[PDB]
Amino acid sequence: GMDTSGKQAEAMALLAEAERKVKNSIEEACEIYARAANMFKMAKNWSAAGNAFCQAAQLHLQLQSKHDAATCFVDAGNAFKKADPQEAINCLMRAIEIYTDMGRFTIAAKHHISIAEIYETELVDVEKAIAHYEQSADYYKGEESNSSANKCLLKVAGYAAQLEQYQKAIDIYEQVGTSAMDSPLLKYSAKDYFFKAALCHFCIDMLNAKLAVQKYEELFPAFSDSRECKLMKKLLEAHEEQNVDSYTESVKEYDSISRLDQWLTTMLLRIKKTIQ
Amino acid sequence: GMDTSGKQAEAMALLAEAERKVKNSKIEEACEIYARAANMFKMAKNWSAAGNAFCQAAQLHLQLQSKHDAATCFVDAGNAFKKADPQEAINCLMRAIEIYTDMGRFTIAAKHHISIAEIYETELVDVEKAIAHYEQSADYYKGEESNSSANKCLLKVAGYAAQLEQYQKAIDIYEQVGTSAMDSPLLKYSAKDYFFKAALCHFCIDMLNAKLAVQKYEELFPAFSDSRECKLMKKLLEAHEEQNVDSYTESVKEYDSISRLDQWLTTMLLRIKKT
Amino acid sequence: GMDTSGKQAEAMALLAEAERKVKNSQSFFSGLFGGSSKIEEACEIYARAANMFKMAKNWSAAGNAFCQAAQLHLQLQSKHDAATCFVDAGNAFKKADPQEAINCLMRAIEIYTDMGRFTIAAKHHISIAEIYETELVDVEKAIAHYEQSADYYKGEESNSSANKCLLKVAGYAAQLEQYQKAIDIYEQVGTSAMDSPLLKYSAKDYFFKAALCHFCIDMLNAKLAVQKYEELFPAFSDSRECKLMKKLLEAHEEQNVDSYTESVKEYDSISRLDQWLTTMLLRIKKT
Amino acid sequence: DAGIRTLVMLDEQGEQLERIEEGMDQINKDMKEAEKNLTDLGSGGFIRRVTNDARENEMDENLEQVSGIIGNLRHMALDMGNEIDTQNRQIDRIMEKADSNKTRIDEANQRATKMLG
Amino acid sequence: TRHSEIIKLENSIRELHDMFMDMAMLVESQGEMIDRIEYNVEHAVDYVERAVSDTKKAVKYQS
Amino acid sequence: MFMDMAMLVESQGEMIDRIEYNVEHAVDYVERAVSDTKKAVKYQS
């Protein structure tokens, strides 16, 4: 349709006009660049719109402007998000650096979360996602935003248990559960976290899991009443006899009563495989 | 009624005096006084005349050096004409949308696109015309990363296409939205429904491939098995395998006993069952 | 990692440069009367030093820089930025040194209330009460701060926020074995909350607590208070609370400790009990 | 308990939202006045009884209780929903205002720089 | 009697379900919307402060 | 689902509180600037 060709031609004309204006040597050039990038965005030419945005941001930063420069850098980053993830990462890193320089820690943490998200979803990398999530959690905890920090720590612990050693998962789950028990609204969920921790201990050895569950049961009396406690006690007893059939029966019955996360399935499969 | 006549007379007099004042620097005062006269007409509640005066004042403001005021007056005139000739309101709101897009405010442009699509579909019978506006708004929202609004627009357009018998677009949109919702930690509970709907549309094409489609949905989403929708649809397909009308009628009556079926679902069910 | 050493070294260098700048500022002013450009620039360096120290996890240095900047900008008659930096100290020293954060927040509160900005003063008072409560068991200061914040909020006509402060004050006072204040606050809030559409559902709970807080005084007045509450809020009868109180009263009327304990155990089994309720029940059982 | 906490804290959120709306309106009015002045400067059972027995009683009674509680939830939940809707509208209504406010200062500042030279 | 009571219970459960989904989706939309306003107002306040500071410095330079 | 709704609502509430603080700061500064402008215009005239 007319949109593609017309907007592309107008964008090229505006880019040439801004280039000529700077060739005379200034805010007018930045305005022309911003308008041309906007029309590029309308034209669906996702690529090369971030290029114009970056050029405008650099030109504006040339005259000591930092706020609008950071906003346009973030704009170019999100524009490149779909067209080119790597340059989106770079633009977001620049914006994070500047925002941290002015000390707007919430914006930096949000951008770190976005960076971790793009890294984990499109590209394949867990360590970078873990580091970015940890940085965002540290920023938020410094800003005492407890819920976001808890979410980030839970995600990091989940990934660490998924691939990394279980000590990080043990620590994070224990800390989060301990913080959660006292909370009036959140107390009900606390059990969950504790349960997860216990399972990770089982991956190391049965005796470590036994001592950990004993300590948790002592610490949290309600945990004794949890169906989870009964399930782990039964599973540990079955494992202690090298009897796989009881293991399978208990797992199947528990799944029948309630569906599985597919994380518990993975951990239980790992534990069963090592029963020998 | 006395009130209508009094307000009409007062607004007529105010607009006449405004015209005299403008006819007598002067552009700003003329625009302001015309705005006051159009507001008094709005209180007089003569929708056609009030909207006409508002749009004339908007054009005069366009004559004045300002854009935001121009767009605001345009949207106000479109709202006033909402209860008048749809073409004039559509044109004014389209100009306002263009003016807003030119500034880069895509969110308000998409909102206005949705509004004009709504008036187009509710007032006139043209549905395909509203499809274009809905798709444009959905594209704008997706570009701005507003997933909820894009999902709403996609659902509406997919439902309209399914009603229009373009089952391919409906099935594609339904499957995409269902899988996207399934991925999200929240809204997952609703995902099942989308899948179910798709099956019905897919049944319009044939019955044999419906079995494969339901099996694919089952393996992709095991929880869908426990949903009453899966049981109902498999029972309906099995009953349809034999040319007996009573079986599916009883099944649908049993399902309806719990919850009333919507008009779209009932129409689709009647279409499938009658043939 | 590199962060600690690098940030520390750069922050020390920048802070020393700022100290030299402020030292030379007096000479510049005496010889040329440069104005406040040097002082403003020094304050900028100091604020940057504080923020970098915060990034470097060195909270004490950041707090010291914030306090210095507060003092310097207060010396420039800018009480608003001085109060902002006082609150910066209050939130930076909060973890490094709670006591310093206390006086910083008092200074900020005084500055703010000087202009009548009561909401910010009430928020700071609430923060200070929280600081007192979380670390120290000096309940009395927490009660005083909460009462002051509640009075400020009431003076601002912002209801539903002074209410929570009054509930906290009453709950803490009830722990000190002074029951009249707790009874009065609980009954007042309950009677206020009956009429609210949204809060109505919760109102019953308050009455329960009051009656329990009225139980330690003596059995007879608790019975009569139960009658008074029930006649005013008939729906209260439906709640399990009335049944539990009636059963406990019947058990205690004949010194039947076993029945009382069994009923308490059953109720806890159905729904886990709170530490406050557990303590109150244990105190009542002593009789 | 979760339902009740949600209701009360939603009420608090609504109060805060109204407060911010009032503050924003005040800001807009003050800004306009200042700009103009500066310009001028120039049910019988639930379980069938196959064998009766005490076991069949408590079961049924539990169900009874369950049903009652569910009833309450309905009304409870319904009420909560209403609140959210109102908030939605009010929230929207602030953006426009605030946005306009911002725009004003921009042009105002631009004008403040264009009259000088 | 069994059918009536059981179906009534199931219908009530379904009603609660549907309305909870609707309200939670509305809450999500509201959350995004509030996220937007925060940054909008922050930028507005920062820019007005910057502009007024420029005004003070300029007027004091001229006087 | 009830437990799931709770924390969303709580987060919304705290975030509203932050916005409210920002708005109070903005309005206070606006009032102070208005007072300064009044002083300047009255005394210079």
Numbering used by the authors:
A (entry chain K): 0 to 24, 38 to 288
B (entry chain L): 0 to 23, 36 to 286
C (entry chain J): 0 to 286
D (entry chain I): 41 to 82, 130 to 204
E (entry chain G): 197 to 259
F (entry chain H): 215 to 259
Which statements did the authors publish about this structure?
The membrane-anchored SNARE (soluble N-ethylmaleimide-sensitive factor acceptor protein receptor) proteins provide the energy to drive membrane fusion in various cellular contexts, such as intracellular trafficking and exocytosis. Supercomplexes of NSF, α-SNAP, and either a syntaxin tetramer or one of two binary complexes of syntaxin—SNAP-25 reveal atomic details of SNARE processing and show how sequential ATP hydrolysis drives disassembly.
To gain insight into the structural nature of binary complex formation and disassembly by NSF, we prepared a complex of NSF, ɑ-SNAP, and the binary t-SNARE complex (21bin20S) composed of full-length soluble SNAP-25 and soluble syntaxin-1a (1–267) in the absence of divalent cation (i.e., non-hydrolyzing conditions) and performed single-particle cryo-EM. All classes revealed substrate-bound NSF without Mg2+ needed for ATP hydrolysis and disassembly, and share the same overall architecture, with a spire composed of NSF N-domains and the ɑ-SNAP—SNARE subcomplex on top, the NSF D1 ring in the middle tier, and the NSF D2 ring forming the bottom tier. A representative 21bin20S model (class #5, 3.39 Å) and ɑ-SNAP—2:1 binary SNARE subcomplex model (class #13, 3.74 Å). A linker N-terminal to one of the syntaxin H3 domains is found within the catalytic D1 ring of NSF (light blue). The D2 ring of NSF (purple) does not engage substrate. B NSF (light blue) engages one of the two syntaxin molecules in the 2:1 binary SNARE complex (dark red) via pore loop interactions involving Y294 (protomers A–F, indicated). Three ɑ-SNAP molecules bind the 2:1 binary SNARE complex; a flexible linker between SNAP-25 SN1 and SN2 blocks access by a fourth. Of the eight 21bin20S classes with the 2:1 binary SNARE complex from the dataset collected under non-hydrolyzing conditions, six engage syntaxin and two engage SNAP-25 within the pore of the D1 ring.
